[PDB]
Amino acid sequence: LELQEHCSLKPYNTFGIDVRARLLAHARDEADVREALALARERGLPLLVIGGGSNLLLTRDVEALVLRMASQGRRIVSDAADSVLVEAEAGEAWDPFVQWSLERGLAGLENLSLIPGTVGAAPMQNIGAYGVELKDVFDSLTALDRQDGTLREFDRQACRFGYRDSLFKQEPDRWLILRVRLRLTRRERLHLDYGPVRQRLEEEGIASPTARDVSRVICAIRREKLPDPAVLGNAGSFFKNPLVDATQAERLRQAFPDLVGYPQADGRLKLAAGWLIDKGGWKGFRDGPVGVHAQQALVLVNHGGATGAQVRALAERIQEDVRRRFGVELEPEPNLY
Ligand SMILES: Cc1cc2nc3c(=O)[nH]c(=O)nc-3n(C[C@H](O)[C@H](O)[C@H](O)COP(=O)(O)OP(=O)(O)OC[C@H]3O[C@@H](n4cnc5c(N)ncnc54)[C@H](O)[C@@H]3O)c2cc1C
Ligand SMILES: Cc1c(C(=O)O)cnn1-c1ccccc1
Secondary structure, eight states, rough: OOOOOEEGGGSTTTTOOOOOOEEEEEEHHHHHHHHHHHHHHTTTTTTTSSSSSSSOOOOOOOOEEEEEEEEOOOOEEEEOSEEEEEEEEEEEEEEHHHHHHHHHHHHHHHGGTTTSBTTTTTHHHHHEETTEGGGGGEEEEEEETTOOOEEEETTGGGGTOOOTBBBHHTTTTSSSEEEEEEEEEESSOOOOOHHHHHHHHHHTTTTSSOOHHHHHHHHHHEEEEHTTTTSSSSOOOOOOOOOEOOOHHHHHTTOOOOOOOESSSSSSSEOOOHHHHHHHHTTOOEEETTEEESTTTTTTEESSSSHHHHHHHEEEEEHHHHHHHSSOOOOSSEEEO
16 A cells, blocks of 8 residues: 555545544555555554545544545446446545546436545445435445455445435444446436526526536535535534424424424424524534534534544534424434544
8 A cells, every 4th residue: 555654634534633543544446455454453453444534523543544545447337228337436536426427428416416525435324415315326336344354245225225324334344335336327307306406507598407517507506505625624514404203393393483394205304404503593603613604504614723522522512402402313424533
């Protein structure tokens, strides 16, 4: 590998937290993952796999081997007429991957445009946006099993995809994703449904609504709402949207008339966590070098040189303050290390 000893991780996590790793390693392919894995054992260290570090909260120096996935390769596997199965290596940067697909003439990823991170990490959290989740186009992946080292294929059912969840987040540290295969489409009628994405597409003339168009749109909305971690350290939205049983829903319902909620198919209501945190007077909060954004209340930030623990403590403060005022527990989205 390109091994580095006791070296900072500030340029490796979108929060910008400066903690040291006992060893840093960059994996270019599967041969590099194997040896990196025999090191972590042949030096008694635990192994921490990272991609772009945009779903990751670091709180202490990492007495691990940190293995940054930098595997590279973007390929069409199959071409059926209306569906195309593509495959990309784990370290491939996600958004350029999206551009690659649109370049090739394919739809399916367009609503996941400009999401940070790697292809390898995308199945971990089942990345979702603008009504689309990775499972909608997920076909299969290849993962290294860290109990015995044997590669196996995971079809879609086997991944137990959930809202910002998967078997790989349920069974953490077991599986190391190397490859991801998605089925993309051509010339499918356009997946858009009464939102700002549409409002702003149909203003452009909408001669034809190609995925490339909607992908151009979505970037623009992203570039206007979401804080860039290149200026304000963050890991995007910090809390998942909580969903409550119909009984919890009914009591909060007639306690706040606003209650931005969303009804699911199983009967229960998924509350807008942005509302909860904003109704809790948290928007624009700042204590020391951490806070929440002044617009998107879901985005916790490091204004400058914060610690992961401070971020972690603001998170916890918010969760209690919410739970102790509405009776809902906000779960986080990033993984804490
Ligand atoms: C500005 C910003 C905007 C965002 N917007 C969105 C959004 O719209 N929608 C959304 O869903 N998310 C969003 N995110 C968060 C999203 O989860 C991450 O950006 C991205 O999905 C994580 O990819 P990564 O390679 O950076 O993973 P990392 O942060 O590097 O890793 C996260 C977790 O995955 C594990 N992991 C990483 N690579 C592998 C691998 N190869 N095999 C196994 N486990 C692995 C790590 O160990 C860790 O547990 C946003 C984040 C930021 C900073
Ligand atoms: C959660 C979310 C959705 C969604 O729930 O579909 C669409 N965009 N985002 C988002 C919000 C803040 C930061 C990053 C992403």
